[PDB]
Amino acid sequence: MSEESQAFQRQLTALIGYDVTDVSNVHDDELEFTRRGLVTPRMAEVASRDPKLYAMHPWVTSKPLPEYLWKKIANNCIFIVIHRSTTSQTIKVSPDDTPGAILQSFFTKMAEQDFVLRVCGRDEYLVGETPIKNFQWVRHCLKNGEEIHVVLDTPPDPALDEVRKEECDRKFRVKIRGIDIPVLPRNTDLTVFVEANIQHGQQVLCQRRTSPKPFTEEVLWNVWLEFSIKIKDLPKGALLNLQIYCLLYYVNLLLIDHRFLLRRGEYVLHMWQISGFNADKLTSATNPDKENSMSISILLDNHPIARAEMPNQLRKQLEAIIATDPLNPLTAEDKELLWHFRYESLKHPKAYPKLFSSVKWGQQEIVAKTYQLLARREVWDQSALDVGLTMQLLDCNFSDENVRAIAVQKLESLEDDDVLHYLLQLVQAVKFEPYHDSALARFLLKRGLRNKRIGHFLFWFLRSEIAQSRHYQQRFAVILEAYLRGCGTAMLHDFTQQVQVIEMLQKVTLDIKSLSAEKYDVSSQVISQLKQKLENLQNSQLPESFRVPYDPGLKAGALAIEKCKVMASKKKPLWLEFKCADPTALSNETIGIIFKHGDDLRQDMLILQILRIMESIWETESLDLCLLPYGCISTGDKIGMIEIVKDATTIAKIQQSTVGNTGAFKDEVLNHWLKEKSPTEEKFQAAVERFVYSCAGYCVATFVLGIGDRHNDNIMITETGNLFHIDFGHERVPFVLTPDFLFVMGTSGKKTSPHFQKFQDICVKAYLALRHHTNLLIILFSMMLMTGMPQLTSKEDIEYIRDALTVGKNEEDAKKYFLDQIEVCRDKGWTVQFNWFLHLV
Ligand SMILES: Cc1nc(N)ncc1-c1nc(N2CCOCC2)c2sc(CN3CCN(S(C)(=O)=O)CC3)cc2n1
């Protein structure tokens, strides 16, 4: 390597948080093979992308402009203000106008083709052949009733984006020699055995055990486990799962490797423990900690890898099967039915998941017929993209390259707008890939290199996992390094600044938790310290500026120390606020961010993101439920940052405001509070207006996910009437619709107001509109559970959501069912709200 070539990797490693060159936690070369694998897709994409558009990353959408935003223009005319030094002219514009089309208009109307229309305050540009109606920023503006302010400045230089110059029939069998652990201790000497399983996509193909022996730090068997599957019947991506019961430890090994070579020889694998089903169990990675872990020792010794129409009534039997949720499990009679009629099943795209689950992948001949089936793909290829189907075929139930590859094929037609919607879940879905290199891994790579916004979020999502997942940090690290090597020095520089900032801040956050009561209230001595230490960074540490990781358009400047604090929580998160480093920004409002250690924010991200998906699903049907999914990025182990929504108050505090007698609750306060924060009667009804939708919004969403049973503290509202929930870190009620809410709406205990009619009316559309994507939500959710929560019941836990969405019912029985939830609120008022801790001591 070149000397300076090695100062780079060094750079890359500290941007990643893992050393992708290290080879001390491998027993083969699949990861290095995969660094090399991706060089071609990396370069292929770097080469093909437009320098000048990649530079500006215009945020754009082909979707139609929703009905609700259409009424927001009663004139087929849009007002775009333009700024240059002092003065600023305003220009009438048409929804269909174009950036070029108005730079030209601007010059004409003025008593040249080498500038650009940027936004004030942001690195967000209005550039390229898009209708102005189709720029995200513009659609966001019309929503909130804000003028569209744009500065005329010169395009950024593609030079800065430059990328550094790239330089038998034998039954299979396995010999278990022994296990070994440095220190077992627990209590009683329960016997112990191994469980050797041959798995494909969680499907078990075969199973064997060893004579149970009482637990001792060393245990030797020398035993050959004689499997039933034939060496030649082994399918690609087939794991030898090895397990230790007394379930204490597990480890995996791909039996067929990354060059289609059957595995062979001695292996000494270091096993993972079990914390007092989920995707960590599937990992091909071994435990880096070779000092404390249990160890299994094994030996392989065993290469290649080369008409008629249905009756009228089975057809119906089949169509029934195909017409059922992603969970409703298949019986052998189902499975044999889908298979005998592979070809009729193939004419229906929605059958595909179920159909490829009906494959016996422990048989060369039947896998072989499957690929023939995949060959003749005319009908799948033609179909519209169902992100649901696509995702179901990427989950843990499929471990065949070819199945998975045809799903990723289907993603290719997603525009960035949508890639951003599903990016997080796709990145988590990489966990279910048998092999480090993969269609999906290469697709995520392509799309981040093609679009700086996707590149940005892709970086954090990957860095988030590497940082806190030993099971997958290796595989993800290889993919990030892949990314980082083609994003350009422009971006590499932003990531370096961002990584600096957050690391300094995370120092400050933990040092503050250590110095404070186990929970009780911030001392004055903390307020001193916190402000003191921030100033101690504000000088010659904190970089000048940095992109806000949850909003990469926004560049934070210097801290506003006066406005910083430690939050009186229980953990001690930081309430930090920054000046905006952009002078062009037509405001003085700071950029608030919270920094928390002690909550696993990955759950929060996952939830915030589903929330976004919901908001776009209602977009498809012309509905706007005014959610407020604030930004929240996970950065490390139980540690990350959070956006501060401006001018929002907890509902707890608006109640607790008036005495706040631990729980004496009054129905009047909210509506009063709104008028206080509303100077004119005008802006008030607009607040009541929003509340209705915002409230309606969260009632539906919150219920569906089964996180609707929450305390006051964790629900906030803006001075401007937007209600929202927070803190989605992990008798009853369906959701929170307290009498104080209903008061704003007009009701007061088993009555009906004009606005409450409205409320119900909204909720029902919203509930119905979501059921139009039942499949989508069931798959997103269940994937959430496997890759995001603790170890879950791969039946019991997920089952809730099916019920919530009232699967297998008509719209009436379902609308009814929801209205009944509305009622269980009006029957319990404050009771569990009041019950929300009456427990304290
Ligand atoms: C902590 C946390 N963890 C997780 N995972 N998720 C969310 C939150 C979270 N986020 C908040 N945001 C501020 C508004 O924008 C959105 C975020 C707030 S405000 C609050 C009310 N408070 C403001 C006043 N103070 S104080 C005196 O500490 O400043 C009490 C807390 C508690 C709270 N908790």
Curated annotation (Swiss-Prot):
Q: Where does ATP bind?
A: 592-601, 627-635, 724-730
> Which GO biological-process labels does this protein carry?
adaptive immune response; angiogenesis; cell migration; cellular response to cAMP; dendritic cell chemotaxis; endocytosis; G protein-coupled receptor signaling pathway; hepatocyte apoptotic process
Protein name per its UniProtKB record: Phosphatidylinositol 4,5-bisphosphate 3-kinase catalytic subunit gamma isoform
* Pfam family of the protein (one): PI3Ka
Function text: Phosphoinositide-3-kinase (PI3K) that phosphorylates PtdIns(4,5)P2 (Phosphatidylinositol 4,5-bisphosphate) to generate phosphatidylinositol 3,4,5-trisphosphate (PIP3). PIP3 plays a key role by recruiting PH domain-containing proteins to the membrane, including AKT1 and PDPK1, activating signaling cascades involved in cell growth, survival, proliferation, motility and morphology. Links G-protein coupled receptor activation to PIP3 production. Involved in immune, inflammatory and allergic responses. Modulates leukocyte chemotaxis to inflammatory sites and in response to chemoattractant agents.
Question: Where does it localize?
Answer: Cytoplasm; Cell membrane
| PROSITE patterns recorded | C2_PI3K (PS51547), PI3_4_KINASE_1 (PS00915), PI3_4_KINASE_2 (PS00916), PI3_4_KINASE_3 (PS50290), PI3K_ABD (PS51544), PI3K_RBD (PS51546), PIK_HELICAL (PS51545)
What does the further note read?
Candidate target in therapy for inflammatory diseases. Selective inhibitors and protein ablation are anti-inflammatory in multiple disease models such as asthma, rheumatoid arthritis, allergy, systemic lupus erythematosus, airway inflammation, lung injury and pancreatitis.
Gene name, per UniProt, is: PIK3CG
Region annotated G-loop, chain positions: 566-572
Instruction: Name any one GO molecular function.
Output: ATP binding
Tell me its EC number(s), please: 2.7.1.137, 2.7.1.153, 2.7.1.154, 2.7.11.1
Q: Where is this region: Catalytic loop?
A: 706-714
Query: Coiled-coil stretches, from where to where?
Result: none
Q: What is the lineage of its organism?
A: Eukaryota, Metazoa, Chordata, Craniata, Vertebrata
- Impact of altering K596R? Loss of kinase activity. Loss of autophosphorylation. Reduced inflammatory reactions but no alterations in cardiac contractility
